[PDB]
């Protein structure tokens, strides 16, 4: 299978056929869509079907997806669950999750079927509940224990892992320990599961099962969790609304008062670069003469941009650092806009800040908004205006709206991200083609020397240690290899 700009060898992997009814589209799983760099917006992929048994033995053993878990660029994993299986494991493995007996047995068999060969025991084994006396209830962490109890081999003991999350402890309350992931003898005992555990992230739970149990088990656990966080989503959904994007009236007064202290910021940075002082007014004729002097020089305008941008990025960083955990109406678990950004499911904290607080400085080609010959950045503004807004600082957010002047600068910044993309791929495309003709018959020999195709020697070992990059991940993780000594033996 093949995504068409084939920039590295993991973009052409080998799949097993599963013929479906009622379709005309090739149909893919979400673990693969980060490897191919594909998304479901209308992308096409090429399906090649090999015609002898020598090639079938190499689409199963050399180029299959199970051996392509780690990329050879740095040894980092590229296969994992992507967007909404991430944001479902922050609810399933939460501390609020309590399932009854009918529900607990339904999420096990929803993802682990013995008939299709998912189990290792041919009889689905379960756990005692974590609450006995009022009503028997299972915890949501205890489902992740049961699915690892069933898909891992019975003779090997459980996994042992101590890792972290992407979610800080203070989003959960006072004295929570939900940042610490803990597996002891294959049982999840502490901490929620994120992108940092079963996403495409290093030293998670799926990366650690890959090391102890092998690539065939680590490819099953992504399928088992792919079905687990789909039946839980269908029973317990996940949405994002208008109330997720609103600051409370206490916190909405906070961003007004900090942005009230930005009307002086443009002049003070402009009074600094002109080497005046004392808060000289903006209409000073000995000030406007210097701003025209700055305007004609490309050097001096670079200084005035850098001073004023770094001075208004402080006010941008004061509004965000006061509002976005605290000024919001819905707090963390219920505010799905933050939980998509904290879990690493989709977006960043920069996207949440521009929605809820303000856009910030619209930096163009690194510098700032360009300027006409007349000292005007738009026809709306006075010539040589030392306003921060006139230089391209957007005090508006996407929740409430941006003014027509600052809608025009934001289209300037939007277009330089699109003309730079059109000139992006042509640059590094020829750099890669040019390497792959010299470094193209270069291979590891049987005496571990790296040689060219004609036999000329290039290196005497691969990197000085002859270690494959896709193998040396836990090689220097000695604490992990000691906690799992018998399972790794």
């Amino acid at each position: 299978m093949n995504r068409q700009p084939t920039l590295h060898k993991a973009s052409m992997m080998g799949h097993k056929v599963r013929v479906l009814p009622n379709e005309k589209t090739l149909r893919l799983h979400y673990a693969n869509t980060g490897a191919y760099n594909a998304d479901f917006d209308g992308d096409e992929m090429n399906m090649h079907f090999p015609q002898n048994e020598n090639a079938r033995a190499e689409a199963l053993n050399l180029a299959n997806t199970d051996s392509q878990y780690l990329t050879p660029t740095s040894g980092s994993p590229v296969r994992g669950l992507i967007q909404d299986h991430i944001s479902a494991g922050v609810w399933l493995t939460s501390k609020d999750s309590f399932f009854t007996r009918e529900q607990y047995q339904q999420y096990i068999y929803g993802c682990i079927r013995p008939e299709d060969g998912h189990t290792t025991r041919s009889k689905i084994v379960t756990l005692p509940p974590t609450i006995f006396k009022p009503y028997p209830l299972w915890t949501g962490k205890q489902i992740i224990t049961t699915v690892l109890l069933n898909v891992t081999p019975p003779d090997m003991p459980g996994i042992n892992l101590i890792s972290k999350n992407k979610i800080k402890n203070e989003y959960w309350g006072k004295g929570s320990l939900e940042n610490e992931v803990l597996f002891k003898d294959g049982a999840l005992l502490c901490g929620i599961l994120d992108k940092s555990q079963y996403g495409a992230s290093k030293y998670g739970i799926v990366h650690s099962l890959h090391e102890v149990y092998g690539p065939e088990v680590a490819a099953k656990v992504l399928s088992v969790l792919g079905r687990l966080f789909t039946n839980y989503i269908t029973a317990t959904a996940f949405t994002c609304g208008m109330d997720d994007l609103r600051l409370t009236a206490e916190g909405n007064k906070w961003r007004t008062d900090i942005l009230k202290t930005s009307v002086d910021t443009g002049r003070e940075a402009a009074a600094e670069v002109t080497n005046l002082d004392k808060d000289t007014p903006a209409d000073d004729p000995e000030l406007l003469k210097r701003l025209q002097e700055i305007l004609r020089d490309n050097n001096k305008s670079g200084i005035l941009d850098a001073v004023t941008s770094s001075k208004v990025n402080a006010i941008t960083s004061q509004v965000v650092s006061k509002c976005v955990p605290d000024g919001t109406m819905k707090k963390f678990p219920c505010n799905s806009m933050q939980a998509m950004a904290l879990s690493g499911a989709k977006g960043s904290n920069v996207n949440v800040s521009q929605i809820m607080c303000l856009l910030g400085q619209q930096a163009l080609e690194g510098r700032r908004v360009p300027v006409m010959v007349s000292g005007k950045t738009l026809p709306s503004f006075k010539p040589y205006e030392t306003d921060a807004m006139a230089g391209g600082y957007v005090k508006g957010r996407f929740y409430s709206g941006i003014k027509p002047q600052e809608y025009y600068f934001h289209c300037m910044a939007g277009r330089e991200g699109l003309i730079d993309t059109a000139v992006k791929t042509s640059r590094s495309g020829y750099l890669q083609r040019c390497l792959t003709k010299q470094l193209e018959g270069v291979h590891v020999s049987y005496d571990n020397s790296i040689r060219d195709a004609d036999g000329t020697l290039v290196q005497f070992m691969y990197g000085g240690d002859a270690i494959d990059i896709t193998k040396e991940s836990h090689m220097t993780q000695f604490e992990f290899c000691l906690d799992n000594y018998y399972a790794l033996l």
Partner: protein, 41 residues
Amino acid sequence: RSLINPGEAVGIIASQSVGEPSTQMTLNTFNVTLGIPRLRE
């Protein structure tokens, strides 16, 4: 057991591990030549 295997195409891999993350640094000024034009020299 973590050694490189003989016959491994370490020349294609080393070239695909440089050209492929270089489709990620086409950007402008944030003193020395930066990014792809430095890499093209």
